[PDB]
Amino acid sequence: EPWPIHPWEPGSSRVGLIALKLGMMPLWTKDGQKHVVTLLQVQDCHVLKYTPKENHNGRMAALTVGGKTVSHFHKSASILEFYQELGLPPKQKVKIFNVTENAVIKPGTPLYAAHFRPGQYVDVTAKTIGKGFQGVMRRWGFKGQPATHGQTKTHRRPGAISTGDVARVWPGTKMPGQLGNIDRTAFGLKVWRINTKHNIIYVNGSVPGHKNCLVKIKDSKLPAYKDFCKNLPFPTYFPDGDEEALPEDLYDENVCQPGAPSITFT
Amino acid sequence: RKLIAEGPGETVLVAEEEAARVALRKLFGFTENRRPWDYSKP
Amino acid sequence: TKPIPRPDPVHNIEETHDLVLKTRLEEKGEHLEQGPMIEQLSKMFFTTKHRWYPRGQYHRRRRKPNPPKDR
Amino acid sequence: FKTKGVLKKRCRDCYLVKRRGRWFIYCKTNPKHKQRQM
Amino acid sequence: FREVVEILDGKTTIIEGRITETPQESPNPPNPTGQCPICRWNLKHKYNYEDVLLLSQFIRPHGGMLPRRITGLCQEEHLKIEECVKMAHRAGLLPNHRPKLPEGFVPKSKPRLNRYLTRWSPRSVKPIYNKGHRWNKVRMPVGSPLLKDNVSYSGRPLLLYH
Amino acid sequence: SSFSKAPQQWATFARVWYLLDGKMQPPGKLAAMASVKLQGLHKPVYHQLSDCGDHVVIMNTRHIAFSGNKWEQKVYSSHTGYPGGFRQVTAAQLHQKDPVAIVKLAIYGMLPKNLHRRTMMQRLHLFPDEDIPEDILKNLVEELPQPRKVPRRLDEYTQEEIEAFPRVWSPPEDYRL
Amino acid sequence: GSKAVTRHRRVMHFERQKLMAVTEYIPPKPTINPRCLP
Amino acid sequence: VKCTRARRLKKRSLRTLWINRITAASQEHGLKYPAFIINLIKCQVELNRKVLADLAIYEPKTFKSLAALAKRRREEGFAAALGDGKEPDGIFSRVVQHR
RNA sequence: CACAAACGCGUCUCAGAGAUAAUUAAUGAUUUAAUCUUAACCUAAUUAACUCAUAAUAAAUCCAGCCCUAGAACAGGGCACA
Ligand SMILES: [Mg+2]
Ligand SMILES: [Mg+2]
Ligand SMILES: [Mg+2]
Ligand SMILES: [Mg+2]
Ligand SMILES: [Mg+2]
Ligand SMILES: [Mg+2]
Ligand SMILES: [Mg+2]
Ligand SMILES: [Mg+2]
Ligand SMILES: [Mg+2]
Ligand SMILES: [Mg+2]
Ligand SMILES: [Mg+2]
Ligand SMILES: [Mg+2]
Ligand SMILES: [Zn+2]
Ligand SMILES: [Zn+2]
Numbered sequence: 001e002p003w004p005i006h007p008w009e010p011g012s013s014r015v016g017l018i019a020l021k022l023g024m025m026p027l028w029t030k031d032g033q034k035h036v037v038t039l040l041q042v043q044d045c046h047v048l049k050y051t052p053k054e055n056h057n058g059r060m061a062a063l064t065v066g067g068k069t070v071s072h073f074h075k076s077a078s079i080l081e082f083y084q085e086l087g088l089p090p091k092q093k094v095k096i097f098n099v100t101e102n103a104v105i106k107p108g109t110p111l112y113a114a115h116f117r118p119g120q121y122v123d124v125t126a127k128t129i130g131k132g133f134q135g136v137m138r139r140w141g142f143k144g145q146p147a148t149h150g151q152t153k154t155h156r157r158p159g160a161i162s163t164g165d166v167a168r169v170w171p172g173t174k175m176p177g178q179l180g181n182i183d184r185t186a187f188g189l190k191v192w193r194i195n196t197k198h199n200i201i202y203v204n205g206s207v208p209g210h211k212n213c214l215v216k217i218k219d220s221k222l223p224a225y226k227d228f229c230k231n232l233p234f235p236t237y238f239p240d241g242d243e244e245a246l247p248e249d250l251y252d253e254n255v256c257q258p259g260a261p262s263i264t265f266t
Numbered sequence: 267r268k269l270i271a272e273g274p275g276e277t278v279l280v281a282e283e284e285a286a287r288v289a290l291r292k293l294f295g296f297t298e299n300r301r302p303w304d305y306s307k308p
Numbered sequence: 309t310k311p312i313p314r315p316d317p318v319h320n321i322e323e324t325h326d327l328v329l330k331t332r333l334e335e336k337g338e339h340l341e342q343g344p345m346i347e348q349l350s351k352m353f354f355t356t357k358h359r360w361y362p363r364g365q366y367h368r369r370r371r372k373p374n375p376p377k378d379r
Numbered sequence: 380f381k382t383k384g385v386l387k388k389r390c391r392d393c394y395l396v397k398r399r400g401r402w403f404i405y406c407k408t409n410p411k412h413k414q415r416q417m
Numbered sequence: 418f419r420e421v422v423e424i425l426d427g428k429t430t431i432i433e434g435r436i437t438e439t440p441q442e443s444p445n446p447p448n449p450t451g452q453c454p455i456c457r458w459n460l461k462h463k464y465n466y467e468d469v470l471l472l473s474q475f476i477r478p479h480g481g482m483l484p485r486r487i488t489g490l491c492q493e494e495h496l497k498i499e500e501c502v503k504m505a506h507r508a509g510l511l512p513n514h515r516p517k518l519p520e521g522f523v524p525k526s527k528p529r530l531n532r533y534l535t536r537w538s539p540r541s542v543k544p545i546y547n548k549g550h551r552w553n554k555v556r557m558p559v560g561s562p563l564l565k566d567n568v569s570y571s572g573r574p575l576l577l578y579h
Numbered sequence: 580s581s582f583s584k585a586p587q588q589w590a591t592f593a594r595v596w597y598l599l600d601g602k603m604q605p606p607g608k609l610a611a612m613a614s615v616k617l618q619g620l621h622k623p624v625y626h627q628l629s630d631c632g633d634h635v636v637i638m639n640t641r642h643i644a645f646s647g648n649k650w651e652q653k654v655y656s657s658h659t660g661y662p663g664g665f666r667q668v669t670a671a672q673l674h675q676k677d678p679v680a681i682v683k684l685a686i687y688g689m690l691p692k693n694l695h696r697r698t699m700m701q702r703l704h705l706f707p708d709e710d711i712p713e714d715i716l717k718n719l720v721e722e723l724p725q726p727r728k729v730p731r732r733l734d735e736y737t738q739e740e741i742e743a744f745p746r747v748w749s750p751p752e753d754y755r756l
Numbered sequence: 757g758s759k760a761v762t763r764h765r766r767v768m769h770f771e772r773q774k775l776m777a778v779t780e781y782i783p784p785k786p787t788i789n790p791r792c793l794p
Numbered sequence: 795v796k797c798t799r800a801r802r803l804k805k806r807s808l809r810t811l812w813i814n815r816i817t818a819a820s821q822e823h824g825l826k827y828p829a830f831i832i833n834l835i836k837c838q839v840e841l842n843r844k845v846l847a848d849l850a851i852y853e854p855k856t857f858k859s860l861a862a863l864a865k866r867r868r869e870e871g872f873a874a875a876l877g878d879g880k881e882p883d884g885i886f887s888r889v890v891q892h893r
Numbered sequence: 894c895a896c897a898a899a900c901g902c903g904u905c906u907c908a909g910a911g912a913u914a915a916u917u918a919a920u921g922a923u924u925u926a927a928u929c930u931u932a933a934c935c936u937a938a939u940u941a942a943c944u945c946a947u948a949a950u951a952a953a954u955c956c957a958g959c960c961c962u963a964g965a966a967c968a969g970g971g972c973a974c975a
Contacts, residue, residue: 172661205905210962274590298581400541419755443745453792454748481922506933521935531644537931559647623819623850
């Protein structure tokens with residue numbers, strides 16, 4: 001029972017995915033340059049619930065997406081009831097994507113890594129590697145005191161924190177504290193390769209967060225690539241709509257494929 | 267269509283009951299504005 | 309003046325079992341946390357959330373058990 | 380433009396105009412006569 | 418009233434003047450002995466920015482002022498009426514006395530903020546960030562000082578700076 | 580007059596909802612009566628310790644009017660606490676960003692500086708336009724008069740009044756407008 | 757304690773300021789303005 | 795010490811409370827407190843603020859009658875000031891000596 | 894770098910709208926010429942700030958024990974594939 005598909009509009013936005021960070025790989029370009037890609041595996045992406053635009057923000061609708069499957073025996077009663085009503089096993093990470101009202105998808109719809117095509121810019125949101133309660137030098141990068149010129153019990157102290165006349169410290173003072181376990185977003189990550197069989201996305205650059213962690217992927221909201229979704233499948237990628245199996249690996253126009261003639265300059 | 271009494275209340279039913287009580291008190295003469303009891307020596 | 313508005317509606321009545329229908333309108337209950345409960349009370353009574361919090365032993369002991377009453 | 384407390388015309392073609400809440404001596408023949416009352 | 422009419426007919430420009438009928442003064446002024454119009458109609462120390470019927474009598478259809486040598490007012494009343502007309506125009510009165518611009522009325526801007534008794538121009542006053550302390554306070558002027566001589570039935574002086 | 584104790588107390592200390600139109604009205608004069616009603620200074624049974632307080636619903640907030648050049652001169656300064664986080668917003672900019680903020684700050688300043696200020700502010704309802712929920716509309720009792728009489732425009736004057744108003748001066752026929 | 761004659765205008769006492777304000781000059785104001793008068 | 799100071803200040807505080815209640819009850823009748831007080835004094839009605847507040851709280855009809863009397867006295871005074879006539883005197887503006 | 898991690902010397906990313914101060918010219922009366930206007934009507938070229946689109950969190954009442962790239966304690970994520 002698919003919901004009606006609306007035509008793509010210039011002011012429209014698409015829904016994202018929730019993948020798993022596998023690791024990092026090299027990738028060489030036809031010009032001889034070397035880039036580093038990160039593998040994001042879309043294991044289980046499913047639309048859980050749909051929230052109306054008026055009831056969520058008043059400008060854009062909200063689509064809820066679930067991550068990889070988890071066990072029923074460690075989830076709460078309400079979450080288990082929600083997933084029982086939905087008809088799907090519980091997911092680990094549940095996220096909300098702001099999408100336009102013309103790109104809404106029926107809940108319970110699965111999603112695949114072919115939703116992104118080779119050559120596109122995506123934004124990646126995840127919890128970075130949490131380093132715990134770290135010192136000021138590792139947290140804010142403050143220089144330390146000289147090591148052996150007589151300094152006593154001061155090699156890593158932050159030093160002065162405020163001024164004498166103020167008689168207090170400003171709230172914006174940089175001090176030791178929790179570092180790392182916060183949600184961060186990297187913008188403008190180019191995608192080079194899409195592996196369809198294993199649902200793998202090769203995103204250029206580093207991905208915030210440790211390996212084997214859930215990562216929220218969406219399109220780039222930067223003004224440079226605001227209207228790149230015209231050529232992409234607007235609602236989502238439907239493997240049944242085309243009735244044609246995509247190739248195993250979709251490469252960009254510049255990626256040097258593993259099967260190459262060992263390109264040489266002229 | 268002649269007002270004989272009025273009563274306030276938290277709800278409509280309580281207000282109506284208070285109005286009925288006020289009307290009954292006015293009919294029986296036991297009102298706050300009645301004559302005070304006569305304490306004299308006849 | 310305007311006529312008294314009367315609202316009388318029983319939507320819990322069932323033709324199968326009136327005994328269960330009667331308990332359907334009485335089995336309504338709800339429990340919330342302290343924060344949401346205080347917020348709901350403040351919203352209902354147009355007050356702040358600071359009033360609904362309880363008070364300690366020192367203040368609860370010093371209240372007069374039998375305050376004077378006039379009239 | 381020269382910012383001054385007192386404005387005076389340095390030639391016969393300078394005109395005084397109230398603009399932006401201040402007084403301005405504007406001259407077209409001699410642009411160096413542009414004066415602004417502080 | 419005189420109107421200039423231009424006619425274009427085959428590379429020929431005809432400029433002509435046409436005289437129309439104009440209203441005259443009312444037959445009975447309360448004080449015929451007064452030389453000045455306002456001073457003889459006993460509207461001195463009476464008018465204000467709210468009185469639009471008097472301010473609209475002598476103004477150009479595009480909101481421009483009228484020369485005193487043609488109007489006949491005394492200098493003080495002329496200045497006061499000029500101030501009142503400026504205040505009314507800034508406050509939004511006299512809606513029909515603005516130039517007609519077919520091209521400019523389509524691109525709407527931010528809604529006009531309601532104001533009254535405005536002394537300075539809206540585009541020439543910088544906000545007061547210091548605002549002064551109690552003893553030295555930068556008071557905000559309201560109304561024109563030329564209207565301080567108006568009749569005060571309550572008797573309280575008009576606060577020109579608040 | 581002859582009421583029982585509980586209904587008499589309820590009637591005496593009942594809360595009242597008032598309405599206040601804010602179109603073409605000065606914020607100071609609106610806030611004066613708003614503060615009076617919020618404190619309950621209009622009741623002979625008023626007392627500081629008592630909770631005598633009335634609700635006020637002010638509409639047409641976006642159409643407020645400032646006397647003089649206050650739109651361009653009056654400023655509102657706030658500080659986020661962080662260094663360099665001191666902002667000064669002009670009255671016009673603050674009204675554009677949030678219509679409610681102007682009258683809200685005016686009433687907050689006019690209210691007394693005790694702890695009851697927050698309680699009586701929570702009883703205040705401000706709406707930019709004439710779009711009031713029915714749950715609030717059903718509670719309104721009376722509408723307070725506007726403290727300032729809105730002056731008429733030239734086109735709003737009737738032709739009979741225009742003709743009745745005498746022509747002070749007679750323009751010459753030779754002049755051109 | 758300042759000298760009798762100073763350069764800073766020697767701000768006066770409050771009673772003296774009140775006396776000056778009371779004794780300020782008041783020009784005679786005719787009932788009718790004579791400019792537009794016959 | 796605070797007990798003594800507050801005993802001294804209690805009279806002022808209660809007088810201010812009575813004045814505030816009188817202002818409330820008078821503005822409820824559309825009359826200002828200074829005008830109400832001066833016009834009630836001009837009528838040789840020597841009622842203090844305590845009694846006036848008690849009447850406002852518990853005798854609405856009596857307080858409305860007093861407000862009407864004050865407004866009538868104010869109107870008579872304004873009419874006399876406008877007229878500037880010795881012969882025309884208001885009904886309620888007549889002064890009665892001691893007996 | 895004698896721990897599966899951390900780290901730089903190694904690698905990736907870094908943004909649209911409004912708004913202005915000074916200063917330019919259009920139209921126009923007081924001062925029927927002109928004149929950017931503490932005269933209006935819309936004007937257009939315009940600093941840095943500053944806000945706003947946008948971005949992140951944003952599914953409440955199972956938590957004994959065992960692991961964790963999560964953590965001072967407390968908290969948080971997993972324990973069905975194998
Ligand atoms: Mg950690
Ligand atoms: Mg070092
Ligand atoms: Mg040493
Ligand atoms: Mg050492
Ligand atoms: Mg030592
Ligand atoms: Mg300090
Ligand atoms: Mg001395
Ligand atoms: Mg004494
Ligand atoms: Mg001209
Ligand atoms: Mg020119
Ligand atoms: Mg925002
Ligand atoms: Mg857990
Ligand atoms: Zn010159
Ligand atoms: Zn004159």
